[PDB]
Amino acid sequence: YQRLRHMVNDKFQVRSTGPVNSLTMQPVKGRKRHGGIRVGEMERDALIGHGTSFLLQ
Amino acid sequence: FSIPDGFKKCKHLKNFPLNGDNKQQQVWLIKFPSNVDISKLKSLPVDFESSTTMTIDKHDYKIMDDTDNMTLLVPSESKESLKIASTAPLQFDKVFSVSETAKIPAIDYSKVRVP
Amino acid sequence: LRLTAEGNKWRTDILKTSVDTGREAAAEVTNLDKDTPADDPELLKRLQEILRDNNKSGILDAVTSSKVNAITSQVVSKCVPDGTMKKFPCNSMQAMALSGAKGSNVNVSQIMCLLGQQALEGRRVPVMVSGKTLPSFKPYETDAMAGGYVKGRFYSGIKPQEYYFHCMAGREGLIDTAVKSGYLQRCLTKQLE
Amino acid sequence: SEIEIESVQDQPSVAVGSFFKGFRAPSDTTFDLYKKKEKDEFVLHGENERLEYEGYTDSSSQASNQYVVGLFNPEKKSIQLYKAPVLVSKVVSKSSKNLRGPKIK
Amino acid sequence: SVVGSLIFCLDCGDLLENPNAVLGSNVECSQCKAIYPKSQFSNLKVVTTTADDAFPSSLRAKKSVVKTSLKKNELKDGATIKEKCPQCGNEEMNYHTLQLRSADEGATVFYTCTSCGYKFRTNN
Amino acid sequence: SSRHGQKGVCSRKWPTIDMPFSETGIQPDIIINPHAFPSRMTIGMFVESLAGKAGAL
Amino acid sequence: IVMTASAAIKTPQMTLPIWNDVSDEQADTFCKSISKVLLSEVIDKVIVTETTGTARSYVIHMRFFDNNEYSEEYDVSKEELQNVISNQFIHLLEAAIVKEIKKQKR
Amino acid sequence: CEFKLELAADTEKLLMVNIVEEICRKSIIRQIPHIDRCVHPEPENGKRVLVTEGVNFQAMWDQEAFIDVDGITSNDVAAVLKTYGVEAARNTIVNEINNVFSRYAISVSFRHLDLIADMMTRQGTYLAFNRQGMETSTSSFMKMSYE
Amino acid sequence: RTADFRTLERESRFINPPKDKSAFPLLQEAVQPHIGSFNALTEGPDGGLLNLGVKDIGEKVIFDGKPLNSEDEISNSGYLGNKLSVSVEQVSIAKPMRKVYPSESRQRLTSYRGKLLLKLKWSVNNGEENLFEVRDCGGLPVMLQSNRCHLNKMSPYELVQHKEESDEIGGYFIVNGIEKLIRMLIVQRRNHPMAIIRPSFANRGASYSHYGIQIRSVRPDQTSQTNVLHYLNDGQVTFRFSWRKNEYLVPVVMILKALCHTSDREIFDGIIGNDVKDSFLTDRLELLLRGFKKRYPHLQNRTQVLQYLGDKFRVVFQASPDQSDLEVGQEVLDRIVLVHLGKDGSQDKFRMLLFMIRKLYSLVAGECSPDNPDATQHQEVLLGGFLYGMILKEKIDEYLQNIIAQVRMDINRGMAINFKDKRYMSRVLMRVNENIGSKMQYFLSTGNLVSQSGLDLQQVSGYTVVAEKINFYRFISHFRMVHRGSFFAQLKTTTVRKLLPESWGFLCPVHTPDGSPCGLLNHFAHKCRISTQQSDVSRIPSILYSLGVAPASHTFAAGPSLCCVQIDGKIIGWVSHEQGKIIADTLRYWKVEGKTPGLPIDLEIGYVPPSTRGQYPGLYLFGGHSRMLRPVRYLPLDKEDIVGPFEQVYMNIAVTPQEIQNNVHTHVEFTPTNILSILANLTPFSDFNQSPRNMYQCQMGKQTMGTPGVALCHRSDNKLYRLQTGQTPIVKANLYDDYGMDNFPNGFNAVVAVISYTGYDMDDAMIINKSADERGFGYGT
Amino acid sequence: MIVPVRCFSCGKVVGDKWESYLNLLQEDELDEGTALSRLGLKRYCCRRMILTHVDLIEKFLRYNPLEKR
Amino acid sequence: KAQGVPIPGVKQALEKKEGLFRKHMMGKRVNYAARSVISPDPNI
Numbered sequence A: 001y002q003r004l005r006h007m008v009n010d011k012f013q014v015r016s017t018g019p020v021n022s023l024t025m026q027p028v029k030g031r032k033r034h035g036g037i038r039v040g041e042m043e044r045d046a047l048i049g050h051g052t053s054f055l056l057q
Numbered sequence B: 001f002s003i004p005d006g007f008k009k010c011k012h013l014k015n016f017p018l019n020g021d022n023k024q025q026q027v028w029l030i031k032f033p034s035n036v037d038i039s040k041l042k043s044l045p046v047d048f049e050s051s052t053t054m055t056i057d058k059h060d061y062k063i064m065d066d067t068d069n070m071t072l073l074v075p076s077e078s079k080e081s082l083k084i085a086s087t088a089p090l091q092f093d094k095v096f097s098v099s100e101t102a103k104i105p106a107i108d109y110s111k112v113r114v115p
Numbered sequence C: 001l002r003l004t005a006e007g008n009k010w011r012t013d014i015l016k017t018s019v020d021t022g023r024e025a026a027a028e029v030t031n032l033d034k035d036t037p038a039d040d041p042e043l044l045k046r047l048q049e050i051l052r053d054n055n056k057s058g059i060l061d062a063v064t065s066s067k068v069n070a071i072t073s074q075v076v077s078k079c080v081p082d083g084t085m086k087k088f089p090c091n092s093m094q095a096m097a098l099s100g101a102k103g104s105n106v107n108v109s110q111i112m113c114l115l116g117q118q119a120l121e122g123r124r125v126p127v128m129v130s131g132k133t134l135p136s137f138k139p140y141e142t143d144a145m146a147g148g149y150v151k152g153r154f155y156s157g158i159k160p161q162e163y164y165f166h167c168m169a170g171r172e173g174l175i176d177t178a179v180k181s182g183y184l185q186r187c188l189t190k191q192l193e
Numbered sequence D: 001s002e003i004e005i006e007s008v009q010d011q012p013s014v015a016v017g018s019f020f021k022g023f024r025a026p027s028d029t030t031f032d033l034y035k036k037k038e039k040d041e042f043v044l045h046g047e048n049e050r051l052e053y054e055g056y057t058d059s060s061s062q063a064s065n066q067y068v069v070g071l072f073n074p075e076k077k078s079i080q081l082y083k084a085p086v087l088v089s090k091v092v093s094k095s096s097k098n099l100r101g102p103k104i105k
Numbered sequence E: 001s002v003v004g005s006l007i008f009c010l011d012c013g014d015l016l017e018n019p020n021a022v023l024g025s026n027v028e029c030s031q032c033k034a035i036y037p038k039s040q041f042s043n044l045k046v047v048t049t050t051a052d053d054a055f056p057s058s059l060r061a062k063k064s065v066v067k068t069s070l071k072k073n074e075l076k077d078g079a080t081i082k083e084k085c086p087q088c089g090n091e092e093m094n095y096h097t098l099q100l101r102s103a104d105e106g107a108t109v110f111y112t113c114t115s116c117g118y119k120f121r122t123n124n
Numbered sequence F: 001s002s003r004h005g006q007k008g009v010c011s012r013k014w015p016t017i018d019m020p021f022s023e024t025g026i027q028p029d030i031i032i033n034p035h036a037f038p039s040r041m042t043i044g045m046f047v048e049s050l051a052g053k054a055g056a057l
Numbered sequence G: 001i002v003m004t005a006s007a008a009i010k011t012p013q014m015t016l017p018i019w020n021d022v023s024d025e026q027a028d029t030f031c032k033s034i035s036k037v038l039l040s041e042v043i044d045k046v047i048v049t050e051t052t053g054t055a056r057s058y059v060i061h062m063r064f065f066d067n068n069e070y071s072e073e074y075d076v077s078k079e080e081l082q083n084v085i086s087n088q089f090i091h092l093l094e095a096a097i098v099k100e101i102k103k104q105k106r
Numbered sequence H: 001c002e003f004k005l006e007l008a009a010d011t012e013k014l015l016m017v018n019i020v021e022e023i024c025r026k027s028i029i030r031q032i033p034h035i036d037r038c039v040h041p042e043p044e045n046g047k048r049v050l051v052t053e054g055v056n057f058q059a060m061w062d063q064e065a066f067i068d069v070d071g072i073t074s075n076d077v078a079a080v081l082k083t084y085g086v087e088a089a090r091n092t093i094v095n096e097i098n099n100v101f102s103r104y105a106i107s108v109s110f111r112h113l114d115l116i117a118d119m120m121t122r123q124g125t126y127l128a129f130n131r132q133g134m135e136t137s138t139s140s141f142m143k144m145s146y147e
Numbered sequence I: 001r002t003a004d005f006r007t008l009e010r011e012s013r014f015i016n017p018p019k020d021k022s023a024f025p026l027l028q029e030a031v032q033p034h035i036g037s038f039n040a041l042t043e044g045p046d047g048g049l050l051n052l053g054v055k056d057i058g059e060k061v062i063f064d065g066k067p068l069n070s071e072d073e074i075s076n077s078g079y080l081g082n083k084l085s086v087s088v089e090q091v092s093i094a095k096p097m098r099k100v101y102p103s104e105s106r107q108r109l110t111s112y113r114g115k116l117l118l119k120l121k122w123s124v125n126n127g128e129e130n131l132f133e134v135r136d137c138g139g140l141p142v143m144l145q146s147n148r149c150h151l152n153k154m155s156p157y158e159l160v161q162h163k164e165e166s167d168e169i170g171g172y173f174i175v176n177g178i179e180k181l182i183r184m185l186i187v188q189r190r191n192h193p194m195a196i197i198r199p200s201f202a203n204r205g206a207s208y209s210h211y212g213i214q215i216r217s218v219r220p221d222q223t224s225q226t227n228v229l230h231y232l233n234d235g236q237v238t239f240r241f242s243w244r245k246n247e248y249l250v251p252v253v254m255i256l257k258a259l260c261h262t263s264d265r266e267i268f269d270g271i272i273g274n275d276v277k278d279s280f281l282t283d284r285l286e287l288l289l290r291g292f293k294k295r296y297p298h299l300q301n302r303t304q305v306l307q308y309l310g311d312k313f314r315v316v317f318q319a320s321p322d323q324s325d326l327e328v329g330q331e332v333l334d335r336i337v338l339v340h341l342g343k344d345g346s347q348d349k350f351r352m353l354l355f356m357i358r359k360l361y362s363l364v365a366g367e368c369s370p371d372n373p374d375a376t377q378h379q380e381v382l383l384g385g386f387l388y389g390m391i392l393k394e395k396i397d398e399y400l401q402n403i404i405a406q407v408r409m410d411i412n413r414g415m416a417i418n419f420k421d422k423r424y425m426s427r428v429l430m431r432v433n434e435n436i437g438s439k440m441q442y443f444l445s446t447g448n449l450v451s452q453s454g455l456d457l458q459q460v461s462g463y464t465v466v467a468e469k470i471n472f473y474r475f476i477s478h479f480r481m482v483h484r485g486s487f488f489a490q491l492k493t494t495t496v497r498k499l500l501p502e503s504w505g506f507l508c509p510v511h512t513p514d515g516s517p518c519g520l521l522n523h524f525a526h527k528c529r530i531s532t533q534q535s536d537v538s539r540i541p542s543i544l545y546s547l548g549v550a551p552a553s554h555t556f557a558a559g560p561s562l563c564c565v566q567i568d569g570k571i572i573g574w575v576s577h578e579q580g581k582i583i584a585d586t587l588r589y590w591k592v593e594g595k596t597p598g599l600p601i602d603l604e605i606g607y608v609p610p611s612t613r614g615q616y617p618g619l620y621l622f623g624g625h626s627r628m629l630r631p632v633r634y635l636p637l638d639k640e641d642i643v644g645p646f647e648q649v650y651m652n653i654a655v656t657p658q659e660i661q662n663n664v665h666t667h668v669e670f671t672p673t674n675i676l677s678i679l680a681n682l683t684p685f686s687d688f689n690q691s692p693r694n695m696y697q698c699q700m701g702k703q704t705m706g707t708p709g710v711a712l713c714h715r716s717d718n719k720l721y722r723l724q725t726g727q728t729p730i731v732k733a734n735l736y737d738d739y740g741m742d743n744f745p746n747g748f749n750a751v752v753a754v755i756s757y758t759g760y761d762m763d764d765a766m767i768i769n770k771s772a773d774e775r776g777f778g779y780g781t
Numbered sequence J: 001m002i003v004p005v006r007c008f009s010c011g012k013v014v015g016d017k018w019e020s021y022l023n024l025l026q027e028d029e030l031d032e033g034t035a036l037s038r039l040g041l042k043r044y045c046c047r048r049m050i051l052t053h054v055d056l057i058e059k060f061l062r063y064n065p066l067e068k069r
Numbered sequence K: 001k002a003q004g005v006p007i008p009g010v011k012q013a014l015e016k017k018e019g020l021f022r023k024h025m026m027g028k029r030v031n032y033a034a035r036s037v038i039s040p041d042p043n044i
């Protein structure tokens, strides 16, 4: 057996309230910088899908 | 012209028996490798078509014969140098080419193909 | 993964008819009566005509494939499960395919019987300008193995010639996944939201 | 069928020069042969009122191949062999030796 | 030397102009002003045949010694596996193999019925 | 991963008391699920298993 | 369909439901009728004997397949072939040669 | 068919074979407009049909003795819309999208397809899900967030 | 009685690093195309590559206008003037040394730059007086374990004593502390006319067809120059080439008449052989000859053609202002048309050009099938060291251009002084950027190709990659990895990625990555070798002529109806197809036999038999650099034979000796393991695994936390992954020992049970024993 | 690196049996199998522990930044 | 619609890649969120 060099979650992160960009005032990009997880157009579409307007809000 | 350097003009040229009577005359062209000695051989075995066999001091040869531009220049006189051969331009009656052929050994299958 | 001595005998006997299949199909597409020999000079000239055309080679590949795949189906139908040494419910390899836990009878047949005809982009194995499918095979060889038909199984192993053919099939499967609904769904969702 | 040879000449006498397909010439002009001293290289040169002929031997062909020309008898069945060099001959015209300025604009 | 529709000089080897473009009764070479013709050169003709591959058709395909087209039904599906038909209940069923998605993902099976002729797609 | 392209993430570090124990008294170092092999068809690993055992003994 | 609503589909098709009173042979004959041949499809060989005279003389010989062969493969008569060559082909050939003379001199 | 062509002395050399070849494959003796080949496949679910490799309804309308003119199907949506109307094109969209899924043995509820088709035919035309079809939409913000 | 592991032998070698020849020669044979390539840059016949390269761009002349100041003569008005001729006669890297070892650079995080020596030739007033000054050319990176490097003649005891690995491979460059290697590239096979159908050719110009010929001519200094032939729908043939970064088109009948004095009938006999009755050819050739006579009626001799060519290219080739149109014309020919035959070989260039026209016409008619560029048979491998030498030649050409630029600045202002003064030369030279070392350090640090010509390559980036040492398996695979090209990665074509039978024994069928680099980032077979140079090539025409090859200069007959004999793209003669195979078979016989001195074993004998609408026939022999070569067992004599991918296509090579069929087999493989890579061979029972799982293992072994080295206490790498408890495999291929993989363990032998018990293991999840982990099982740092 | 203390699978001390194993292969000239048996390793898990040990520490030690040459 | 890399205009700012509307309105980076590798569990 061979042990592969990659950590299982090297991309393991958690953010409550971290730093934000000046222009958008939205969570800044960067795991180590206490950055935010992006909720993209497809996740927006899925939240519209469930008819779950407060989850989208 | 005069050029190139180290080249001397050919003054003496040996006689060529050219007549072209009629029981007729035949002009032959032969190709030979540098390895074989022409002055050593006093007899050349040759037959019609591509089929030929020759062996001169361990080395084996084959005389390829083909039916069918090259121009033959025959000396009329030693002082007249060289002139184009004609009867009525001239072409060779029979053209031959000596090719060195080597005998490739038969594969010893009983020794190489093993279960 | 093992077949019984009885079951393995059936496998070798059905696969013994596959040697003729290669030349039989090659003689059918070429249109030659009494089934001409594999080394026939007119047949070899006729197969060359097929080699130079993409459509003609397609007719040859589809005919030979259907015929060798019929030999594959026969092996699988006979040997699995009536020829397997260990049988269901104890044969776990067989059990997982039948239960729907993991795998299918196709995977089971590649393991215990044969890999079959290695199909590349709907056709057989690619062939060189010389008429050779590999430097090991004869130019314009009328054999199923030369076309990519693997008689070997993963339990017994694949013959070096067979293994190279399998690799071509494997790589082709991988590239299509990498190369090939994001924009199609995005266009509908923005107009239907 | 073994054919006998009467005489062999290792001295310059008769030569062969290839031009192109369909070469006639006036058939009254002369061709001056030259020699350089393992293997000897030959140079051919001719002159005419409107044309000029120039020939030479291939360096890669001379050291590797030895060409010979012979005359055959229909009754005696004997060949008289004479060594002949093959000269790659080109023909230059009156139109040649024409050129413009070394540097134009 | 005359070849087909081409007329070449015997002295230099230059291609002589067409007898219709230049002045009548006499033709001359551009390199050396050589004396020509002989009127024995004759009205030159060239027999140019068609490519044979230039006209691809169903009839030209029927003129080929090898098979160029398959019959309406004379082409049977070779691959067959014992599987229960979800349509009604049949034993004989055709199949197809191809490795879709990533190198980690499994193989997809494409089933086909013989009684009706219904295609299928299921990985496991 | 084994030398047969059978990679898997560490789901848990199972205790030896809770681990299945052999007749010999050995508990496996690594546990591979049998449902991995029917789809991958990595029979090289299967023969590697009985070869490695034979060579160890 | 969904993304481009193309009026120029790659494989445009028509499904024609045939009656019961029309047989399998009749339907196949009908398929051929809709089926259409081209001058290329009936020609076997073309021999052009270019003779330069006076005047460039071009002897164009159209060697077709046998009359019964193309009539059974394309449903085309010899009369149908005559009209196309005498009205279309020669007018199209003359226009192509004139265009090639201009392109040579341009 | 033999015919002689006489050209001027100034016309000189020309590649007649290549010129003839190109015009022969350009010359039509026959062909029904917009149709290339008509084939006879195996009867689809018991229905006796003929599959055409082209679209021209008005031409097939003349073959009433062979074809049932009230059942002549076509995959080309725009061609169906032009001759038979918006509701016919709408029915072609739901059938054609279904053919794409049924081939890969994927079942999609017709409630979805009917909605998609109704949205494409909302303007009485054949609109696609793209910048062009979207032009006729009230929300400029929806449009701005598309492209 | 077994295929055991060396335990006693291993541990003794671990303590005692050999003082003699290093163990595992296959490991050094793996980096053989890398080290060898860089070795040929200075060592070998004709002083390596650079000396030849400087000669090609040997002189640059800049003239500043001045009055001649002589007596009454029109020469004063014409004063081109006096030429401050400049030249370079020799360039040589001295060393990267006060000797300095490679290891110091790694700790120091600085480039292991070697000092360059560049001496000039300054000639003025037609070179009456010339002064040569040896000047620093700047600093350039030097490959480790190369001739320039001090470790070239080193040993394993000695390597450990110099803080390196006992069996250190090399092949890479230490640049700013980062080990970077030049990636090998798949490029068109040198000196071979290729008939290709491309729709790209049509969309460029007016009435352009798909048909065309492409030959990649290579200079002895390894720089390439591609010449393309185009068949226009008019019946015209055009010659395409590239200078600077622009394409240029010239009529083929013009480039033919410039090479040597010939008649229109000499061109006719040269292309059309005894097949004079072929109406297709009779018309096409008339279009060419009449077209040239119509367009250029004034060009009636070789000199006029050269002058017309010189007049139109005097600006682009920059050859001015004293160089005549005859000189510039010849300069164009010598630098562009079929450069593989080189200068003083215009007769050879003429013969090869006629052959390309006949091949082009055979492709249009259909007599010849198009050659596939994506296939392994019609390609070679551009080695790193050769690429390094090419860009070096480019930088020294730029260096000379800069000297002239400084003189042009000087003469266009203050005027300063004369060229005969050494003081002025020394003043110009220190005002010019001579740091070529930094320019070469940039290429090895960015992979970006900055060039005035752009070489004969399509891409401009990614020529260099970090020699990633995360584990030895990934590290050794880098030096066996070959890429088709970065340009090919951005294409919708799948034919390029397709594994082909032409790759058998050259390109590994298993070892290719998953996803985007699939079928593009290939790996060579473990027994595959790449040509570093050529020898005895000059003695082979003598052997061929003796075997019945009729000389091309006397024969005058061409076409697919007859066999064409060529040696490294040099058409030497003509023979029949029957005799063509006889020569090809008899050559191979005297090749394997150590009795013949003029015939080398590494020679490629590419015979192409005649076929019905198949490949263009001929006897295309090869001996040159970059060729793909592999060993096989030749059935008669039972001896080793070296085979290339071009000749293999028509060759019948059995896999196992039991599969040898009578009258249809000439060769047999030594071991079928010769067709796989190092990593592909290392996979246990791979002939029992499914195809994509064997492929995934190569990628897995490359990503494993194993041993990146043992000399880590003298390293300073970005990041390293080290398995603490390495173990030797019980189940292993014997080639594991042949590459001494026990020096770098990649895993551990574990008790594995195929069981569904815990419930936490399912498809992509596996269970590890707690007590095993507690005992240090699979621990890493 | 060095011989592991205890067998990964069961926990039987293996670290004291490395140098003794090489002595049984060198001086005693025994085979791999019989040597392991004399050390008291009958389970195949304990058997592979020493049998499969590489001992890269001897290769690693040859680089010493504390002593000259 | 200028020059012919220049400084981007306000039109370019609203359409940088996918655009301000797509990258920062229709989709957004969020607070009170976490990411991790999933592991199987039959006991939950």
Ligand SMILES: [Zn+2]
Residues within 6 Å of the ligand: E009, E011, E012, E013, E014, E029, E030, E031, E032, E033, E034
């Ligand atoms: Zn003339």
Ligand SMILES: [Zn+2]
Residues within 6 Å of the ligand: E085, E087, E088, E089, E090, E113, E115, E116
């Ligand atoms: Zn059914």
Ligand SMILES: [Zn+2]
Residues within 6 Å of the ligand: J007, J008, J009, J010, J011, J012, J043, J045, J046, J047
């Ligand atoms: Zn233990």
